[PDB]
Structure 1
Amino acid sequence: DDVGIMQQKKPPTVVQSRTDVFNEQFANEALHPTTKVIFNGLDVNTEVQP
């Protein structure tokens, strides 16, 4: 139940970068759980609150 403290292991995070137009193909898609993510710069919560 407790909040984790040590850095947890995570699924690999493939970054789809969808544009105006693109040719989606699904050969060699991974079967393991995976994090689809559309944007590059998602480390957006920078401003720390002591």
Structure 2
Amino acid sequence: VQSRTDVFNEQFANEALHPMTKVIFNGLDVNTEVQPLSDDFKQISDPKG
């Protein structure tokens, strides 16, 4: 059951007007990443005295 916006000839004209950008995302939208402020400690596993 479609009337009439599911046909691509009328859908393509109703997307030039108000172009959709935002989609439903039920998480956290990661857009950047952060480096640590100081690479200060080495992370060796079995220490040597």
TM-score range, shorter chain: under 0.3
Give the TM-score taking structure 1 as reference length: 0.20
| Higher RCO structure, 1 or 2 (CA under 8 Å, sep 6+) | 1
* Larger Rg computed on CA atoms: 2
Give the TM-score taking structure 2 as reference length: 0.20
